[PDB]
Design a protein around this ligand. Sequence first.
Ligand code: LQI
Ligand code: ZN
Ligand code: ZN
Ligand code: ZN
Length: 459
Amino acid sequence: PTHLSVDTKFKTEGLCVDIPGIPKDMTYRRLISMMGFKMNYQVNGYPNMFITREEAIRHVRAWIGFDVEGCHGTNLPLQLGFSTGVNLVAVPTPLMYKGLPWNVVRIKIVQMLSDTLKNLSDRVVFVLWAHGFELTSMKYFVKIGPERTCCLCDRRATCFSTASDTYACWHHSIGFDYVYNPFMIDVQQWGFTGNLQSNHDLYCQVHGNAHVASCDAIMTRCLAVHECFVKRVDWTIEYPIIGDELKINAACRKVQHMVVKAALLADKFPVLHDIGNPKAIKCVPQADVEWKFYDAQPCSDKAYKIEELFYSYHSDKFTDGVCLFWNCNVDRYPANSIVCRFDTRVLSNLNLPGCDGGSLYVNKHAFHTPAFDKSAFVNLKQLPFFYYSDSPCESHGIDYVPLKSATCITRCNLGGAVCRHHANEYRLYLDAYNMMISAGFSLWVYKQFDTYNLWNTFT
Ligand SMILES: CC1CCN(C(=O)c2cc3ccccc3o2)CC1
Ligand SMILES: [Zn+2]
Ligand SMILES: [Zn+2]
Ligand SMILES: [Zn+2]
């Protein structure tokens, strides 16, 4: 039960308008053969062009929605649409390109996939809502065979060049003309009633239908993301490290401790209501405060309604003390809150386009996050940068330029000049802070929060 068997059945009903007379009885083995490919009884790591839903979920970073719409099959020009928003027109002699022959179209395809995927995945997974032309056009830009490595590096080959007879990964494919050993999944095989637009529109209002192939390619990948990450959630699937994952997670832990410690010192709340992670630990273990935990898993569809989290009869009084919502996305935060909210609009290799304005944030695990909404924070203000420390001014053990900063809240800065230890610690914390902010996180705090109240914690 590793890969999808080629002898598995393929429902051909969705294919019979572009392919009239298609047999109802059909396997992946026969379909691949009909697509013009020959698998030659090869036991070399590529057992099937098509993959299982479980394999697609593990390779979500590789997903590229793909759709082909006939402008006028062998005689008529095709419109190739991709979930990148690209539309290429191929002649057989929302970015719209004029009609060009396949020999130049395939070059643009390799360029586009390589630029989109090089920092995301070792492969491409073509996400389809298959009607016929997308499958029968694959032979014009795809070559298959045994699993290979890049000519210039150790990564698996994802491209082929007919000019040099060589193979390359997404990083070394400049001037390559064929997509090598791609993967694909037909969403129509999952059991749906009705056309793509009707099933997509049940869950998403952000993607519209202009009737161009890229629009359908976008709706397909969106529907696939809703099915695999919004309605069905799996926090047991690990994902490889492709960027600053560890540094961002470490920075997040440092910022949480810093912000929560300072709020408890500035406003001395008697109780803290920690809403979120059922496996959460006190971020400030030495604080005097009464720490009360409330379990809520990450919401992947719509943000939690504060009325359902707090009401229906716990301290009961959430109005007492402070509330901490560290990645616990709610519709409107109460005024007495400390909040970390991920901004779904952020551009990064970790954040993939999602469903209904939301985004698929992939960092060790995949978390579909509801659309960032500025109105959730009307009772709060943006938390400004500050570094706070009550640790002794003692260096122990990198060089030095004297630090001067109004936001270095330490005994040394209070007393006039920042010590070397607190200057090192301040710069490291500011680096972690910028990492976390640029990863897409946003910090919000109750309006009375004032760092001026921290200077008196040194007396
Ligand atoms: C897009 C965000 C990125 C950071 N996330 C978490 O670190 C996380 C883990 C967890 C477990 C339970 C409740 C909330 C939780 O947030 C997921 C959300
Ligand atoms: Zn390479
Ligand atoms: Zn959508
Ligand atoms: Zn100091």
